[PDB]
Write a protein that binds this DNA or RNA. Structure first.
Ligand SMILES: [K+]
Ligand SMILES: [K+]
Ligand SMILES: [Mg+2]
Ligand SMILES: [Mg+2]
Ligand SMILES: [Mg+2]
Ligand SMILES: [Mg+2]
Ligand SMILES: [Mg+2]
Ligand SMILES: [Mg+2]
Ligand SMILES: [Mg+2]
Ligand SMILES: [Mg+2]
Ligand SMILES: [Mg+2]
Ligand SMILES: [Mg+2]
Ligand SMILES: [Mg+2]
Ligand SMILES: [Mg+2]
Ligand SMILES: [Mg+2]
Ligand SMILES: [Mg+2]
Ligand SMILES: [Mg+2]
Ligand SMILES: [Mg+2]
Ligand SMILES: [Mg+2]
Ligand SMILES: [Mg+2]
Ligand SMILES: [Mg+2]
Ligand SMILES: [Mg+2]
Ligand SMILES: [Zn+2]
Lengths: 161, 307, 89, 192, 91, 57
RNA sequence: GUGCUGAAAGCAUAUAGGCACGAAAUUUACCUUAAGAUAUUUCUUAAAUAUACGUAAGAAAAUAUUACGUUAAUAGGCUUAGUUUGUAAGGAACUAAGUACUAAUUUUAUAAAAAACUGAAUGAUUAAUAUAUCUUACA
RNA sequence: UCUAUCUUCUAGAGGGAAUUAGAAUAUAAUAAGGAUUAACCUUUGUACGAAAGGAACAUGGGGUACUAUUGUUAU
RNA sequence: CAGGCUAAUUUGCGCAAGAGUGUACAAAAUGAGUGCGCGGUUUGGCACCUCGAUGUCGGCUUGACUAAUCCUCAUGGAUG
């Protein structure tokens, strides 16, 4: 508009309905749960020490569950003796007995096969080169989107996303 | 809007979600409605690519002189069939002549490689009415594809005429010659009115410019002669273009299709002249994968020097 | 069943290496003529003009106009007296 | 609107254009070569190849049509039906060679060419091909296929043939004509 | 945007260049119809070339690349500012 | 003209698609190695050979 | 404009409701330009491809468009056959076909930077870890 | 009297942004325009009419080529 | 002069009513003097406005639009 005052009126947004029920007589404390994301300083009652005396009832009481997304189950199918076979095979033929071959043979998660055994250095350096030779076939447009995926993941863990 | 009454973004694909099987009215537009309102006109059979070779007369016994144009068929093959489930309409792609492999690009070399056909000079599509018009890929069409007396339409690019004036381009009369005219004999005169007509030149105004070198269709041209050895199909009347230019010949849309017996005899002659058109095509497709896989891996040199 | 073909090679001028090659198909070297067709149709409205089929996949005469003028003259003048009555003799 | 041009008009009148072509064909015979524009060298090339075709005819009409193209017949006809007739006796056409050259006039920067008579005393492709062969021998290099292809073109119909070509090479090496010639193996390392 | 491959960082190149106008070469007179005359100034001009070595282009490229890796990556849900201040809560 | 053409609309007409095109059809000369246009005769060897055939013959 | 059934309104009514006939106008059809989804068991890892140059043209104010470049009939020449002129001589702007005679012709010319995000389906390879302490082993 | 600066217009181009790495070839929905006249014979001279007069409807009039159709002679 | 306002007038029209004509019978056709209107073509009024004009217009070139229709297409009424 012409003046800043005229712009403020056209861009006005009224306050929340809750604030507009002003008491005619006296003061009243009202419950106005906001439609926003709560911060991390609102400790849930489960994380409060038993000593702490502020564990009140819900403020609702002073006046099914959502769909599962990730419910893992841990299994221990590899006995101590089977951990020695994994260390023998991996060190004997690391190209035939990969972590996928050993994972399927012993019914384990691929990460575990690496927790108990590690391939020889020569084989490890061979894997990094294959992925290094793969990172040279990327053009400038794909190499920039692959770096952004690695920065968005580190930022996510720094509280920046 | 940009084109017509539709405000839909061009990048949105909602066609599959508005189906007549769900109880919706059959739209008046779209590929389905476009084929339904052209079913009668659409030619039953494919056409052929021919080369205009010159004009002459067909002298007939007892006294008939019929001016006619000669069109030659030069190795007309069937290259591809366009189905409705894959392209949205029925058509046959026809090839003409040949081209040197060096001049044909790699994108097109691998296109003919997957069919068993030598590279062609030109390619053109001919719309057919239904799935009965699709022919085996790799079959040659001879002048006998037509019969004497069959009316056809010839589509060819007209002779180029460069920047034309108003007289030659739009048939303007011009102005006077000697009764006081001043430097304005072949000029177009007025280009509009005045402030009451928009104070502008009106879109679509006829003006000088380029003329010619565009497609023109001559309909209802009988077939006077059909000679296989020469490879020619003599049609009555004139045809657009210069000698040595490629033209498209197909059945007339404004005339009834040829009898059922003829449409079947011509299809029965392709199964005799080319008894194995599918075995030679499947073999070429099987080879394309081997070569396409050798190019990917990088071992194409081995196959070239195999024998 | 696999028709005859030749290989076309696209090489590099910088490294002298094969960039990509294709199998170019060629028409039968020795043109193969086929027996007369057995498709005989009887209909008044049309006749199949399959009198004399040429060899498959072969270029026809480039200039059929002078060859066509000798077909109509031989049909409009089976003897030659008319063609000779106006010759340059 | 009408027909296309049959030939180049060269922005001249009818009579002026027939004299321009008769003068280029007169200088071509008298001098065996001429350095003019490319459109002029390409229009006289058709009139010079048809005049040498008349010199290969035994009729008198050809001897009278050759007199009607040249501008000093009394002095140039003996050369036409003499040396030139013997030179091109066995060649089936193609008696002239038009070679594009850098502008003869730098003011207008009009593309120029060289119209010459093949197998002549001033054949510029016979000498340029001899200089290439001279450099190759004097630098221990191997001639390219295009040099070998040009070496045979300039020695197939020539009278002496290879002997006249080896003499030119010998005269260009004893003169040190190839001194300072950039070796073909150092062209990929040069920018300027 | 042109890609180069520099093997000799001392190679000279034309970094900058601009043309200026100098004094008036001369003056021609244009004699038109109706006894009219117009002055035609003959111009002379100069050019300036700023020659630099390829080390300037290798430095300017590393700066542009560092400025592109310093703007951060693209995030799906950015935290755009709300630029209106009001003395109440709207939620 | 009704108005004076601005610096923008005159700079469009002068330089938009009117940049001088770099000649890239340059090859070396077989006899001497000097840079010449493609399909064209060397100007320094033409004059030298043209003069070499005028002295001795 | 002309009807069928048929009530509101026991009748009547081509009025509501349910069907229909009906014009050089409209729409489609026909033709052209534009549009550029899509298609190909199509090509490309620094190219595919395009451009430049050269011979051209079914193209032509520039530009653009469509071919060709020696493994080549693109243009010119030559040759034969036509056509034309004319004495069945001698020529020839021209057309067709043939013919590599001339030119497409100098030693890695130029442009082209080239695979995003989320979900789902489905493979390959790999520490894809943390905490305590300052020594540890060897000679 | 006027060598067209701007908008509009008729043509043709340089660059471009595309579901998006870029291309070769053939291309649809759809869009914008073009084409657009009239007459004559042919009703069982019929319906109608005392007579004189005289329609509507419909088909055909593309072929000294094919084909269709109508005749003509030969079998 | 053109544009602008007005519509007396018009060689621009419509509707309502119906004296009358139609051998008969208002409305097949016809329609006195009138009333209610639309519209911006002719002759005018005004004067916001200086500009291409006193026959304000003709011919040529090239249009675009309107429909109150001369031709072509569909059709109701017509003791007449
Ligand atoms: K004049
Ligand atoms: K009605
Ligand atoms: Mg042309
Ligand atoms: Mg005239
Ligand atoms: Mg306006
Ligand atoms: Mg305007
Ligand atoms: Mg000039
Ligand atoms: Mg004269
Ligand atoms: Mg004076
Ligand atoms: Mg009822
Ligand atoms: Mg009723
Ligand atoms: Mg592919
Ligand atoms: Mg390339
Ligand atoms: Mg041009
Ligand atoms: Mg030729
Ligand atoms: Mg302008
Ligand atoms: Mg379409
Ligand atoms: Mg009509
Ligand atoms: Mg007949
Ligand atoms: Mg009365
Ligand atoms: Mg009327
Ligand atoms: Mg009636
Ligand atoms: Zn040189």
């Amino acid at each position: 508009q012409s003046t800043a005052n005229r712009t403020k009126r056209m861009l006005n947004i009224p306050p929340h309905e809750s604030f507009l029920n002003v008491p005619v007589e006296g003061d009243r404390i009202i419950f106005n749960p906001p439609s926003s994301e709560a911060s991390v300083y609102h400790t849930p009652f489960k994380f409060l020490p038993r000593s702490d005396p502020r564990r009140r009832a819900n403020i609702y009481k002073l006046f099914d569950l959502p769909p599962v997304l990730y419910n893992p189950t841990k299994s221990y199918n590899v006995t101590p003796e089977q951990v020695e076979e994994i260390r023998e095979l991996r060190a004997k033929d690391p190209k035939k007995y990969s972590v996928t071959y050993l994972s399927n043979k012993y019914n384990c998660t691929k990460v575990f096969i690496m927790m108990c055994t590690q391939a020889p250095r020569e084989h490890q350096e061979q894997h990094k080169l294959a992925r290094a030779r793969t990172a040279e076939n990327w053009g400038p447009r794909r190499a920039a989107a692959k770096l952004d995926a690695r920065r968005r993941k580190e930022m996510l863990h720094r509280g920046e996303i | 809007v940009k084109y017509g009454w539709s405000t839909l973004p061009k990048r949105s694909r909602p066609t599959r979600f508005n189906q007549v099987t769900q109880g919706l009215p059959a739209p008046t537009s779209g590929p389905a409605a476009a084929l339904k309102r052209r079913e009668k006109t659409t030619p039953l059979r494919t056409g052929v690519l021919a080369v205009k070779k010159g004009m002459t007369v067909f002298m007939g016994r007892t006294g008939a002189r019929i001016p006619c144009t000669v069109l030659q068929l030069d190795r007309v093959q069937v290259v591809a069939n366009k189905t409705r489930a894959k392209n949205g309409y029925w058509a046959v792609q026809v090839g003409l002549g040949e081209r040197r492999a060096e001049n044909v690009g790699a994108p097109q070399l691998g296109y003919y490689e997957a069919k068993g056909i030598p590279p062609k000079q030109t390619l053109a599509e001919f719309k057919v009415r239904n799935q009965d018009g699709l022919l085996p890929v790799g079959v040659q069409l001879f002048p006998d594809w037509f019969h004497v007396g069959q009316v056809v339409d010839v589509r060819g690019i007209t002779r180029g005429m460069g920047f034309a004036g108003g007289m030659k381009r739009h048939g303007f009369a011009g102005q006077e010659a000697s009764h006081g005219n001043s430097l304005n004999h072949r000029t177009i005169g007025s280009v509009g009115g005045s402030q009451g007509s928009g104070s502008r030149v009106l879109p679509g105004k006829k003006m000088p410019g380029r003329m010619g070198a565009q497609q023109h269709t001559v309909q209802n041209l009988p077939i006077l002669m059909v000679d296989n050895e020469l490879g020619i199909v003599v049609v009555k009347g004139a045809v657009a273009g210069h000698k040595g230019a490629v033209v498209k010949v197909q059945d007339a849309v404004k005339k009834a299709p040829p009898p059922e017996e003829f449409v079947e005899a011509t299809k029965q002659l392709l199964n005799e002249r080319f008894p194995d058109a599918e075995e030679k095509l499947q073999a070429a497709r099987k080879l394309h994968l081997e070569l396409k896989e050798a190019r990917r891996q990088g071992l194409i040199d081995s196959l070239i020097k195999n024998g | 069943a696999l028709p005859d073909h030749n290989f076309f090679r696209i090489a590099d001028k910088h490294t002298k290496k094969t960039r990509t090659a294709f199998a170019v198909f060629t028409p039968p070297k020795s043109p193969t003529t086929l027996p007369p067709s057995s498709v005989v149709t009887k209909s008044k409205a049309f006749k199949i003009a399959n009198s004399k089929l040429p060899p498959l996949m072969t270029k026809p005469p480039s200039d059929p106009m002078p060859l066509l003028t000798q077909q109509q003259i031989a049909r409009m003048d089976p003897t030659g007296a008319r063609t000779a009555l106006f010759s340059k003799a | 609107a009408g027909a296309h041009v049959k030939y180049r008009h060269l922005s001249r009148s009818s009579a002026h254009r027939q004299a321009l072509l008769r003068n280029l064909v007169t200088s071509l015979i008298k001098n065996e070569t001429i350095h003019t524009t490319y459109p002029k060298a390409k229009e006289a090339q058709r009139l010079a190849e048809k005049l040498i075709t008349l010199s290969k005819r035994d009729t008198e009409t050809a001897r009278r049509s050759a007199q009607g193209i040249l501008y000093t017949p009394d002095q140039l006809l003996p050369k036409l039906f003499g040396e030139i007739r013997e030179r091109y006796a066995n060649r089936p056409g193609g008696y002239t060679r038009v070679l594009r050259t850098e502008p003869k006039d730098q003011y207008s920067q009009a593309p120029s060419a060289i119209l010459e008579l093949v197998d002549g005393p001033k054949d510029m492709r016979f000498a340029m091909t001899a200089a290439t062969v001279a450099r190759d021998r004097e630098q221990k290099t191997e001639s390219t296929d295009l040099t070998k292809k040009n070496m045979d073109k300039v020695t197939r119909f020539r009278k002496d043939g290879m002997r006249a070509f080896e003499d030119m090479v010998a005269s260009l090496r004893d003169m040190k004509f190839t001194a300072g010639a950039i070796n073909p193996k150092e062209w990929k390392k040069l920018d300027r | 945007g042109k890609h180069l491959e520099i093997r000799d960082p001392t190679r000279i190149y034309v970094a900058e260049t601009f043309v200026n106008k100098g004094f008036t070469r001369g003056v021609e007179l244009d004699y038109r119809a109706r006894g009219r005359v117009f002055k035609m100034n003959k111009p002379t001009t100069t050019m300036t070339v700023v020659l630099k070595e390829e080390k300037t282009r290798i430095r300017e490229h590393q700066e542009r690349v560092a400025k592109k890796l310093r703007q951060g990556p693209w995030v799906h849900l950015p935290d755009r500012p709300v630029t209106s201040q009001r003395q109440f809560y709207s939620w | 003209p009704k108005k004076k053409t601005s610096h923008m609309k005159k700079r469009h007409r002068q330089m938009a698609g009117k940049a001088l095109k770099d000649v890239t059809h340059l090859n070396r000369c077989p006899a001497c190695g000097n840079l010449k246009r493609m399909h064209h005769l060397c100007s320094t060897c033409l004059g030298k050979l043209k003069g070499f055939m005028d002295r001795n013959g």
